[model samples]
Target: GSMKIDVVTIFPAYLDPLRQSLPGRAIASGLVDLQVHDLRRWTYDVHHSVDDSPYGGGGMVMKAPVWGEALDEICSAETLLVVPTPAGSLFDQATARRWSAEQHLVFACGRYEGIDQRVAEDSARRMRVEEVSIGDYVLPGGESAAVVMIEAVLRLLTLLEGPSYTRPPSWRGLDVPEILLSGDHARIATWRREVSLRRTRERRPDL
Candidate 1:
């Protein structure tokens, strides 16, 4: 069977791109299986509520009971549950490779001040709960961050013919480095690695 990825979020609409981009192509080719679950479905209230005011009377916080129920129904020992937040461990190419190797993956996209600590801890204890951050900025919700991670990881999955290596003619209006078109395999590899490292350093110094 294909690798399965189940996402738990209040905004299922956020996952539309996963079904329309290269990841979508991978799914159609039988390289992966993607499933999105509405977290509200597991809530008990008439509104299918999932959040409440913080205990200390701060901003809103995702309800533990509702998230716990949702997690229990979706997670398994084989699953790697990820929480995308600015406080999370910074995500990178290596992390993408690691997650792609898993048989199952579930992303929990909490909004407001984040999920209750108890809920986060419980999910971590049952399965691998990786807190992932895309950058130093904060998004209104984790769903956007989850989408970023999904696309990153999906692109790293092994395709039928091998790696789908494609270097565009340009990036950010900058021409492709001349070394890449030189037809020197060793030099091309070196240039690519150096470019990747330099780009990362220039764009994300903290990374």
Candidate 2:
């Protein structure tokens, strides 16, 4: 009865942090089950290759069959398939809040140019599929983007402590908002909501 996530990538090692900090704690507490797998397990031939040059263009695209087999092993009726690429829809807090309800999430990461569009389309036929982007940028691979996705998803699962303060609240001539020190919980909550709305509107109006 735990939330589960599985990541398939050629650079599985990039996900070590999942076993290091908050994610590590979640796994230890059995709040989540996270796993990373190397793509070579489904590959054939002496090279264990997972990518090839595009049909009529530049960088390599992850081979469809190799990834297909790997996904076939993990795909299920309740699975949520994800691919982190700049080409996909933007990832955000709302997306995280939505997916946190899912029972299983499978993230397939690609290197070189990217995964073949066909893989995403086919996977969508079986389970919930989301091709998400962490931001409007490109990366060498999807592992880092997957890290961001995991952290965001986990934030929604646990009781998130919003903002914090310490003894030195008046550092650099800036003081902690007086409302936070107020004992009235109702006013404190309202103040927090108002500030959150203001900050969001100023920065990410898209939200």
Candidate 3:
């Protein structure tokens, strides 16, 4: 079955690229269903306020009411809810690979500080909920983070190719790895896995 992807954000324009690039192609080809919604639609106030000053101080906190209404209406038992924020667990290839198998995905793109904590806690009672960060750094909003995750998941579903080398076997005083030049399929495959394991340990020890 085709996967369904729904995104709720205050700034829908940030996700506009989703409809124009690889994500667009997947949706057009009926590989996935994509929908981007403005969070203001759930507001009752004329300002359509989605955030307010934090309870104690600091930045604004996204209101739980709005997020609650949106999630309640969009999600089903099988839906996987993803909230992108700096406080979330790091999003990685393993997580993206797992999400690729999901039938429904709803991304909540928070702004200001982030969505109210209760939103994810409450929603978890019904569907699977995950708050994920793209990296150690922080972003002003989750729209871009959501985009990154969507790109990762979409690419994972499609077998996007691995590393490729062009004409010049050597460049900038460096030569292509000797194993790659050997053209021994069995050794190359074994070497690839070893390289992957070594690189992962060096760069991402937690993985």
Candidate 4:
């Protein structure tokens, strides 16, 4: 079966563009299967609420039972459950490659004060639970992080095949480093590696 991803988020609307872009193209071509779940579906009230006050009574927190219900219905033994947070391990090319190998990937996009600890711990025990952060700053929600991860992972998957695909012309207008347009495969590869490393170093010194 093609690789699958199920994203649980309150803001399902955020994924509309993903289902309409290159990722959407891949899905239509039968290269991958992407499923987005609305966390509110598991809620028990008319409000379809999913979060509440923390037990310690400081800030709001996602309720454990809500997440437990959602995960129980979506995750499987082969699924990789991912949570994106500022406190998470830095996400990188390696993490993308690792997740691409999985049969199923499940992203839990937490809002408010983050997910309930119990739910995260339980899901971790049953599947590969990874906390991935795109950078040092915190996001208001995990949807942005999920989008970053999905795009990165999809590009790596595409690279696994031969490099017959055309590079976007937009790269040229946006300063498509000279070596890439030179048409020398070896140099192009080296150029790409150097560019990636340089970008990471310049933008995220901590990484």
Q: Which candidate is the best by lDDT?
A: 3
Q: Mind giving the per-residue lDDT tens digits that candidate 4 earns over 1-207?
A: 468888999999998888667655777877788878899999999988888888877767888888989999999888888898887999988888877777888999999889887877888788878887899997899999999998888777762222233557456456545665788999887766766677777777776
* Candidate 3: tens digits of C-alpha lDDT, residues 28-72: 888888789999999999999999988886889999999999898
TM-score of predicted model 4?
0.76
Per-residue lDDT tens digits for candidate 2, residues 1-207, read 578889999878888767466545777877798888999999988999998889887878999999889999987989999899998999978899888988898989989899988998888888888888999987999988998898898878862234667787699998988888889999999877877777777777776
Off by over 4 Å in 3: 23-25, 159-164, 170-174, 177-179, 186-207
TM-score of 1: 0.77
| Model 3, residue 168: C-alpha shift (Å) | 2.5
Model 3 residue 106 lDDT score:
96
Q: What digit string (tens of lDDT, one per residue) describes model 1 on residues 21-139?
A: 65447678767878889999998779888888888678888989998898898888777888888888899878988887888888889999998878878987888788889989979
By summed lDDT, the worst window of 10 consecutive residues in model 1 runs over 157-166
Candidate 1 runs further than 4 Å off: 22-30, 158-207
> Cα deviation of 45 in candidate 1 (Å)?
1.4
The clash count of every prediction, one per candidate, is 0, 0, 0, 0
Using TM-score as the measure, the top candidate is 3
lDDT of 2: 0.86
> What are the clashing pairs of model 4?
none
